[PDB]
Every structure is written in structure tokens, then in C-alpha cells.
Ligand binder design. Sequence first.
Ligand SMILES: Nc1ncnc2c1ncn2[C@@H]1O[C@@H]2COP(=O)(O)O[C@H]2[C@H]1O
Ligand SMILES: Nc1ncnc2c1ncn2[C@@H]1O[C@@H]2COP(=O)(O)O[C@H]2[C@H]1O
Lengths: 203, 203, 74, 74
Amino acid sequence: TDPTLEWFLSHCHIHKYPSKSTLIHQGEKAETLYYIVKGSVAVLIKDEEGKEMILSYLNQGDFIGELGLFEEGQERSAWVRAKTACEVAEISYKKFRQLIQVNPDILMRLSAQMARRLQVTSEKVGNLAFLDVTGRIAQTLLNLAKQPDAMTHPDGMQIKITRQEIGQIVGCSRETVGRILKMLEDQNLISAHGKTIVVYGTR
Amino acid sequence: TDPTLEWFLSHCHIHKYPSKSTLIHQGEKAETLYYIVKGSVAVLIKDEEGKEMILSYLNQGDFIGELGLFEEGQERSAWVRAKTACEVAEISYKKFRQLIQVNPDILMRLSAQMARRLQVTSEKVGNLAFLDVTGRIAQTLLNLAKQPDAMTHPDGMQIKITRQEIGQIVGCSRETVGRILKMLEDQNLISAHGKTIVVYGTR
Amino acid sequence: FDPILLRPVDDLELTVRSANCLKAEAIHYIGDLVQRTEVELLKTPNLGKKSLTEIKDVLASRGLSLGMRLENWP
Amino acid sequence: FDPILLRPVDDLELTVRSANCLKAEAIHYIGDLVQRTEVELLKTPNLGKKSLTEIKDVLASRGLSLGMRLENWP
DNA sequence: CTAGATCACATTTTAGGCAAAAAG
DNA sequence: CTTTTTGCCTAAAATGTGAT
DNA sequence: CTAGATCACATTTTAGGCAAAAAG
DNA sequence: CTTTTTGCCTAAAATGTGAT
Ligand SMILES: Nc1ncnc2c1ncn2[C@@H]1O[C@@H]2COP(=O)(O)O[C@H]2[C@H]1O
Ligand SMILES: Nc1ncnc2c1ncn2[C@@H]1O[C@@H]2COP(=O)(O)O[C@H]2[C@H]1O
């Protein structure tokens, strides 16, 4: 049993989002905060042309749609889209604030998560500023063995993902992601057969 | 007069940092929070080889060295180095926490800044994922006319910076930054003579 | 060493379907289970997503999980 | 329009050094100052970093600044 | 294909402390 | 007399070059 | 120089809902 | 009888190709 989160919830509207449905549209007015009760979502952004890019996946326990909560009339900073089907807690900017001064512990929990997210995001910049593409892929393959939905597998951690997607993560062409994977396979670093992949030497 | 910040300060140790001196070493144990009373600093990270990269400049009013404050025994995530000479407020993880439950307004002010920083940082990723180098430069030239230390100038906002540095910002060679600047000069977008630059059409 | 890992599979109170696959794969003690991988278990006949899921949940509310790496055995 | 911009430079209470450069550059009213740029002011003889700084600070504690873009003048 | 990285080094530019000069 | 602007100075830092 | 992007389309792989089959 | 595993199925999504 966990009281602080339990009390928080006793003040929210619950709403189910079907897989691949869009929870937050970049640009919209921001007046509301969301909380992932169950599932996993995708945080992405888009250029004028429509090319997409994945910042991070959030899972049960993680907060979403907070950035407007500190300055007024701010606009949503990125798409947030349901990876699986999600059940989501919702609560207003108006009311969340009333809550802080009742139990700041709750603001802490959000804030805790904020910080970690800056670290990840900062790092991804580093991935981009310093590593070649063959390299950026590597980092991202390891980060995946860290995720919840990652499966234990004899040689190391097993994951399910497309090349097309990996591109939205590492910022390169899908054709390119394919090419490295055939190389990483000669180099016995991975076992790749379909959306199905074995990451040797994690776990 | 501003009471909330004023009270905060009444609980800090003040320390002067000479220009270019290093305030935070990436990796160190984290037990302390800093606050920029006067000046400007540089947030950067490094790869194994020593190549450098600038995340953002912080100015009077901005907080530094917070990320470890939420999970214990965390390690500093990046260099923070004095751009000018700085006068800096310092306060411990131990004691800042005692403060929150005395006036959460103060945690809010930090948190406000946290969010904005995620937006900038996220965006920079976008700059990298979507824009060519000629392009990433452009965005960064505009962001500079937004800074405090930016000077009003007839044709637009004027700035003082090196090509070498710009590279640590936009992630490319110094030779390359030079090349675009001679092009942006034919294209009458800027006036570049030395560390001295006129950004046409801002202001 | 550790205490729960010396108990029989029976101490997990599984369903008949989950219980019957474990006892037919030569997985007798709970210490044997936590070492086994998620993908490996799934190949075994009569064991599908829901049984694999029951196994992962009876271990999780009890501190343990799959694919664990252990020493000093027997 | 705006009220403070119709006042003479004298209402800023400047130092003699700052006062003497403004009145010799044909900058008579405060509305004229806020339109002028930082770099432009600096070129003017007898006006260096500290005077430019006094000008920027007497305007800042009073809402205003330099390089402002204005309409309806005179 | 295209957009950048890379090398060493001769030349150019900057920081910033001081003193003479001008202003008050 | 003091305060502030300007010209002046050199080691150290910043830069262009351009074929591959 | 090197590391990637790019094009269209013939072929391969996946999601996921259902039913037969097996287990309880 | 119910519950759970497995094989089976097709439109839709994912992929390799390779010279420039
Ligand atoms: N870099 C990031 N890493 C993780 N999550 C993010 C990142 N950027 C934005 N988000 C989330 O995406 C949301 C988009 O809309 P909001 O600005 O309302 O709040 C944002 C955050 O919850
Ligand atoms: N992406 C970023 N943008 C702005 N500031 C940052 C960023 N990443 C880190 N910082 C600051 O740099 C500091 C490095 O050490 P800390 O982790 O103690 O706290 C960090 C923040 O204050």
C-alpha cells in the first residue's frame, strides 16, 4: 500500500486511451496534468515536413503533460502518444496547485522525475554531439535492456522493435538502421530475427 | 523588494568564482545546491577524448547543481563553469529540504525553471534531429538575441562570441562554423567582423 | 545463500496448469525458477502468455523475478 | 502614446558626464533615448562603458530600456 | 550522391591592465 | 583634485586555408 | 576524404482475432 | 464443462536493395 499516490488519485478523472491514440498534441493550450496508471506511451516531436522523433517512453508510474504548469497559457511541447493501451489519471492545473500546499511530498515526486528526465535528455544530446550513428544505436540498444517490458533471455536481454522506429529514436534513415544490424550480427553482438532481438551480454 | 528569494538567501553561504573557474565537475558526489546571484556560467559535457559541448548558459536568477537532490548519492551530470566572474549562493541538500516544508513556494520557483529547461533542451534535440548544420547555426544565432548580455544594434541584436565556441554549441567543427558565416554574410543576414556580430532583423 | 530459494515450487501456490509444466521440466525448487529466463520458459509445451504471467506475478509480490544470476548451487 | 517619454532628459537625474553627452547629441526628450541603440550611443565621444551603464540602469529601475521601437512621433 | 571533418601552421584578433588625456 | 574615456600595448587565443 | 541519405517497389514480417485442440 | 495454448489466417506494416 502507498498512501501519498493513493490520496493523489482520489482526486483524479480516469480515462482509457486506446493504443496508438494521441494523448497530447504539440502546440495545444495546456491546462491539465496526466499520470500513467497502466501502460506505456511515446513522447515525440515533429518538424514542418512531418518527420518524427522519439524523446523517451514513459511507463506505469511516470507523469505526463506538466511543462505548462509553471507559467500561464503555455502550449504543449511535444506529442505524447499511447504505445500500448493506457489507463490514465487526469488532473487540472487549477487543482493540482491546491494540492501542493496540502502535501508538498506529492510535488516532490513529480519533481524527482523531472530531474531524472533532464539527465536522460541531456545525455541523448551527448549521444548526438559525440557518437557516430553506428554508435548512437549501440547506446540505445543497451537502454532498452533497462526497460520494464524487456524480457530476460539466455545470452542477454530480449526486445521487440522495428527498424523504422529506431530511426525516430536515433535520428537516421530506416535503411541505415537495417545496415548496422546486419553488421552487429556478424560481430556477434546481437541476434536479430524480425522485430525480435537478442542483446548479448546485458542482464 | 522580493521576500521569497530574500528569505531563501538569508540561509546561504556566498562564494565568489573567478571567471573560467570550474564550479561543478561532472561525476563528483552531489550534496549541494547553487544559485546564481550575479554573472553567467556555462553548462557543458565531455566525451572520453575531451571534446566539449555546451547545453545552455545560465544567468543571474538561474539555479545550478540540483539533479542529485531527489535521489541519494547521485553524481553531478555535467560541467558547470563560470563564463564571467560569478558570485554564488550555496546551500546543502540537507537544509534545502528543511526549507521546502517551510515555504513550498521556493520549491516551485526551482521547479518552474526545471520545466523551461526541459523545453529548451528537448528543442535542441530537435535542432539536431531535423536541421542541417547550416540550419542549427541559424536557430542558435536567434536564441542569442534573446539573451540579457545581448546588445541592441540598429539592424538587429549584436552579440560577441567565437567560432570555436559556436562549435561546442551546435556540434560541428570550428572550420565549418567559419565557412557558413562567410555565406551568411553574402546573404546579408549578418555582419561579422571579429568576435563582433550583427544579427539582422531581430529586436 | 538465500531462504526462499530452497523452498519447493509448491510454496508459490500456483494454478494446476502452471504447476504441471514446472514439475515436468525438472524445476523442483524456487531457486531453480528465478535463474530460468522468460523466453526459455515460453517455449515449453502447454505454457503460454498467461501462465508465464502468473509465474512472473507470484514471484514479484514476493520480491523475486526471472533471469536472475546465482552462486553456490547445491 | 506614453507619459514618461515626453519628459526632458533631466528627469532621469544623470551625472554631469552622462548629461553632457546627451545634450550634445540632440537627445532632448526621454522618448528619444529609449529608441536609440546601445552600440550607437557608445560611439559618441566622451561616452564609455560606465556612462552607457548609468543610462541603462536609470532606465531599468524605471521600466524602460534601449533599442525600443516606437510610433506617433511628434 | 551530399554535407562535413580533418590536418598544421602563418597570420589575424582579443583580453585586459596601465597611463596619458580629457572631462568635471 | 577625482572620475571616466581613449589609445596603446603583448602574450595568448582565434582563424582561414583547401584537397581529400 | 568518410559517413549517411535517398529513391520505388517486390518481397518479407507482424498484429491480433478466431477456432480447433489440449489441459483441468 | 471452462480456461488456456496453439496453429492459422489476411490486410497492413516493415524491409532490403545499391548506385549515386
Ligand atoms: N525530453 C523529454 N523526456 C521525457 N518526456 C518529455 C520530454 N519532453 C517533453 N516530455 C513530456 O511530453 C509532454 C508534452 O506536453 P507538455 O509540455 O504538456 O509536457 C511534456 C512532458 O510530459
Ligand atoms: N540540459 C541542461 N540545460 C540546462 N542546465 C543543465 C542541463 N543539464 C544539466 N544542467 C545543470 O548542470 C548541472 C550539472 O550538475 P548537477 O547534476 O548537480 O545539476 C545540473 C544542472 O544544474
